[PDB]
Amino acid sequence: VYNDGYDDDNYDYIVKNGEKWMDRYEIDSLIGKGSFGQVVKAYDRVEQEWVAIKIIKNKKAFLNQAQIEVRLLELMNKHDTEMKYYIVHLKRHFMFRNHLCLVFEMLSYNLYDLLRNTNFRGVSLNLTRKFAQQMCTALLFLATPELSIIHCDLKPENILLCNPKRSAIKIVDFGSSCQLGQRIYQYIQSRFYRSPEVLLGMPYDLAIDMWSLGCILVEMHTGEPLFSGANEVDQMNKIVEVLGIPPAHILDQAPKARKFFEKLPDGTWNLKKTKDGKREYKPPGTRKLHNILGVETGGPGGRRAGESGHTVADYLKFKDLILRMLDYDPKTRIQPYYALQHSFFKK
Numbered sequence: 001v002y003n004d005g006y007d008d009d010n011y012d013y014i015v016k017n018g019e020k021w022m023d024r025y026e027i028d029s030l031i032g033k034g035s036f037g038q039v040v041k042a043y044d045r046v047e048q049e050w051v052a053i054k055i056i057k058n059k060k061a062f063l064n065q066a067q068i069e070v071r072l073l074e075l076m077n078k079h080d081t082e083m084k085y086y087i088v089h090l091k092r093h094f095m096f097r098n099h100l101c102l103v104f105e106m107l108s109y110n111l112y113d114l115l116r117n118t119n120f121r122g123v124s125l126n127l128t129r130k131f132a133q134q135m136c137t138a139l140l141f142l143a144t145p146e147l148s149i150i151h152c153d154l155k156p157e158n159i160l161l162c163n164p165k166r167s168a169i170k171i172v173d174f175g176s177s178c179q180l181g182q183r184i185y186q187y188i189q190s191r192f193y194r195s196p197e198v199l200l201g202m203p204y205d206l207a208i209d210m211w212s213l214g215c216i217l218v219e220m221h222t223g224e225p226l227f228s229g230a231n232e233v234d235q236m237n238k239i240v241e242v243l244g245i246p247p248a249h250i251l252d253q254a255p256k257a258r259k260f261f262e263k264l265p266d267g268t269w270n271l272k273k274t275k276d277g278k279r280e281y282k283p284p285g286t287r288k289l290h291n292i293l294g295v296e297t298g299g300p301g302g303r304r305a306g307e308s309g310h311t312v313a314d315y316l317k318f319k320d321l322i323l324r325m326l327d328y329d330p331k332t333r334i335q336p337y338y339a340l341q342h343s344f345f346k347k
């Protein structure tokens with residue numbers, strides 16, 4: 001018996017279809033699950049519109065985190081700019097049966113589902129560019145100094161289509177977000193999208209969201225994750241396959257440098273020695289993004305050969321932007337305002 005019967009063994013509310021809450025919300029169905037809890041589809045009879053309700057887990061640590069999310073959402077949603085409409089609208093929140101409930105506008109499926117619908121062939125470069133320009137505008141909005149918000153968990157699952165059959169998107173799930181002054185975690189971001197500074201245990205800022213976006217944009221067009229580590233060591237080695245050893249000035253300041261690397265007598269860094277010399281990774285920098293993208297050979301896996309909107313010039317512009325988003329140095333990684341000025345977005 002958990003929560004007088006309303007909860008399961010995992011601090012989640014046992015969702016029951018057709019239930020009416022507070023003589024206002026008619027619960028249609030469960031639409032998603034997460035570590036935070038659940039999201040249900042409901043009808044708001046008062047405002048006479050469909051809404052999405054995020055049911056936070058009935059547990060203190062998750063509740064405390066969702067309060068941070070509420071503060072950041074309300075701060076973004078009230079800002080006086082047009083750029084704020086790339087962030088999901090939090091309509092209201094309430095406590096119900098000892099669960100914090102966040103009521104959002106109803107959106108459509110996420111960009112992972114969209115990838116699944118192409119059977120992981122990836123979406124067109126033209127559609128990728130549309131996602132990239134919106135996400136860049138969103139990161140610019142998060143970067144306005146009064147906000148200074150780090151999403152901290154950008155991934156295809158947290159970018160949603162507004163309408164299933166249009167290209168407009170919004171960012172959701174600010175559950176792990178923080179502001180530039182108020183960072184409280186060290187193990188952050190979903191692993192595939194985790195920045196080098198986080199893996200190395202170094203200080204981080206809004207630039208970690210730009211790293212995630214670079215990884216996301218490649219995956220949206222190729223259909224598969226750029227860096228699919230099974231654990232942190234595997235994740236760092238997969239980044240090194242594509243981008244080489246991180247530069248010495250970063251590793252010299254990285255608290256977790258020796259989790260992946262060793263410093264040589266001359267002050268240069270290499271990967272840690274592997275067991276009995278067992279070969280597992282491409283040598284550093286030899287898994288070229290130029291070839292992952294198929295810049296000159298018809299796109300990813302050659303699947304865009306003979307298609308418009310996929311010229312070598314297009315791919316070269318795309319690759320340059322991605323590499324600027326994946327700069328090892330968070331101080332020189334491209335920032336949203338300048339990313340928006342990139343030749344990849346000239347049309």
Ligand SMILES: CN(c1ccccc1)c1nccc(-c2cnn3ncccc23)n1
Pocket residue numbers: 031032033034039052054088104105106107108109110160172173174
């Ligand atoms: C349509 N819908 C949705 C889509 C996919 C999966 C689950 C729900 C939806 N629509 C509007 C807002 C949200 C929403 C706000 N915060 N989070 N956090 C985490 C996850 C979702 C959301 N989800």
